[PDB]
Design an enzyme around this catalytic site. Structure first.
Site, PDB file in Angstrom:
ATOM      1  N   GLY A  24       2.769 -13.703 -35.104  1.00  0.00           N
ATOM      2  CA  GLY A  24       3.016 -14.984 -35.743  1.00  0.00           C
ATOM      3  C   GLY A  24       4.305 -15.141 -36.533  1.00  0.00           C
ATOM      4  N   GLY A  25       5.402 -14.619 -35.998  1.00  0.00           N
ATOM      5  CA  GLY A  25       6.705 -14.815 -36.607  1.00  0.00           C
ATOM      6  C   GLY A  25       6.832 -14.232 -38.001  1.00  0.00           C
ATOM      7  N   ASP A  52       8.036  -8.269 -25.375  1.00  0.00           N
ATOM      8  CA  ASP A  52       8.019  -9.619 -25.956  1.00  0.00           C
ATOM      9  C   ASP A  52       8.618 -10.661 -25.007  1.00  0.00           C
ATOM     10  OD1 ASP A  52       8.081 -11.911 -27.503  1.00  0.00           O
ATOM     11  OD2 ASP A  52       8.980 -10.949 -29.256  1.00  0.00           O
TER      12      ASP A  52
END
Ligand SMILES: Nc1ncnc2c1ncn2[C@@H]1O[C@H](COP(=O)(O)OP(=O)(O)O)[C@@H](O)[C@H]1O
Ligand SMILES: Nc1ncnc2c1ncn2[C@@H]1O[C@H](COP(=O)(O)OP(=O)(O)O)[C@@H](O)[C@H]1O
Lengths: 300, 300
Positions: A24-25, A52
């Protein structure tokens, strides 16, 4: 005690696989690069592979990476590659969001082929930039996927002349010939998998914010990790506020609460504290300055 | 356009069900109470029912609530009750984490009985404080659960003397007598359910932080809501920072990013902005002050 540092990891020269994950960043990608940079200073050579799908590994070093291992510009022993999943049309046809959770035989095979390559390169240690999605640990089903394929394939070897060229399988497949590729990939996959399950060789570094939804996704990922048998003992808590503006103080009192929770739940962990910086951690010079705080606790 | 106010909702005198949902400690409970307090000002009477297992509905008003609707202390037309789920041993025996996601017939029946009660009280409008878990919309399965029950029950009612009382079922169950409770509970569940699916009568108000994990969990819960056909057109973005301390400014620049995303995605929504206050929103006087901002956009 367990100091707030990734120093214990950098000091391990037996480590070959170092995972970095976080959902989530929260700054997972930034930590992956920072850990890699700091590893190049201590290890002979460091390979940075990324599962990723955002391929933020590029936007980070501001340099284009592909499936070919390139050298990170400002370095001589640091290299990075971005792996493609390579799920096939067959893979898909063979399968609320846990509907696409099991990998296909084609995808598992492709990854095994890449691990094969990577072993040839003889990179000293590998920092594994995991996918911050729902499928962070999807590659851990590749062993069971290939074994099931190698089994259904061998069970077919028993189904086998005068006919010569016309006497082979329609579709052209050579069973005893694929039984080799499959056995060879399965062996490569198994080597790496039992390495993963070896604490001396493989550890997992969690990244997180000090919010609830992150602290939650973090304990949830450490459970899954402990089940698969993959060592994890380090949590990086990113974007933290440190000590005339009142409302900013309140937001910090909350961090203190979440931060005490973390220090309690993960007593056995290194809990590294990173400050929110005023500019994006994009440059190599900025990634360096940021990476230093992974081994030297930040102070105002 | 659509002003940053829940005013449009407090103005709808046809609304009977107003849900409040939000996952992960973003201020869901506080919004549910605030929205009820503001509703009591305009509507004849307001009932605040809570499916939230934490029963933060008490800690919020500093007053103990039970399964009996009590009157919130400082009010005359605002009342709150806390619904207990009432899953049975059978219920459990009959069934990742989506393993306990389907409710039992005993739980569904219990809730139907409560809806029955609540309709008897004749409260003007109801605010529905949902559970901030993974089972927020679990009650929406009660219609299909009770229908399958009423079916299996009716099918047995076609397979059923000189035996007198010896001719009964063992267990003593009276089928025709149960086919009534079940038809009556199904009818109550269906009424309420087709009301939920009526925009004039039911809307869902989302609560969130301006973080990724929450903005995500929010778009996720709206999707599910739209699938069930339950109207939603308001988001409350809580804990925001507003404009000599540098690092806090950076944290605001990030909010600006998330907030722009929200304004873009949810153009068709009322996007209500709430500031992070310096003290907990606990008192009745503090909840009132907070709730005023749901209808009067905050300014420094
Ligand atoms: N401690 C920090 N201080 C300031 N900016 C940060 C920090 N950590 C990350 N960032 C920035 O925020 C964004 C985080 O992205 P990234 O590190 O890629 O996380 P993820 O890979 O999980 O999305 C990037 O712009 C990064 O430059
Ligand atoms: N805008 C706000 N400013 C300051 N404190 C808040 C704000 N919103 C919520 N809080 C406090 O933070 C906690 C939020 O809890 P709550 O409102 O119950 O959210 P949830 O019900 O989702 O946990 C409570 O202590 C509440 O008093």
């Amino acid at each position: 005690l367990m100091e707030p540092t990734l120093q214990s990891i950098l000091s391990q020269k037996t480590l070959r696989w170092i995972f970095v994950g976080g959902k989530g960043g929260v700054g997972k990608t930034t930590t992956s690069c920072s850990l890699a940079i700091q590893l190049a200073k201590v290890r002979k050579s460091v390979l940075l592979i990324s599962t990723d799908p955002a391929h933020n590994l590029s936007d980070a070093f501001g340099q284009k990476f592909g499936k070919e291992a390139r050298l990170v510009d400002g370095y001589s022993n640091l290299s990075a590659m971005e792996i493609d999943p390579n799920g096939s049309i067959q893979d898909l046809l063979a399968s609320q969001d846990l509907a696409f959770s099991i990998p296909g035989v084609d995808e598992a095979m492709s990854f095994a082929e890449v691990l094969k390559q990577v072993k040839s390169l003889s990179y000293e240690v590998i920092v594994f930039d995991t996918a911050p999605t729902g499928h962070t640990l999807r590659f851990l089903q590749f062993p069971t996927v290939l074994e099931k394929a190698l089994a259904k394939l061998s069970q077919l070897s028993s189904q086998f002349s005068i006919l010569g060229a016309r006497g082979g399988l329609p579709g052209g497949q050579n069973i005893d010939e694929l039984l080799q590729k499959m056995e060879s990939l399965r062996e490569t996959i198994s080597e790496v998998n039992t390495q993963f399950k070896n604490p001396d060789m493989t550890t997992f570094v969690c990244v997180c914010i000090a919010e609830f939804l992150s602290l939650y996704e973090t304990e949830r990922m450490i459970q899954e990790l402990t089940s698969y048998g993959i060592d994890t003992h380090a949590i990086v808590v990113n974007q933290l506020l440190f000590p005339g503006c009142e409302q900013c103080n309140a937001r910090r009192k909350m961090q203190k609460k979440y931060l005490e929770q973390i220090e309690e739940l993960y007593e056995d962990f290194n809990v590294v504290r990173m400050p929110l910086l005023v500019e994006e951690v994009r440059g190599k010079e900025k990634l360096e300055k940021f990476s230093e705080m992974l081994v030297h606790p930040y102070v105002p």
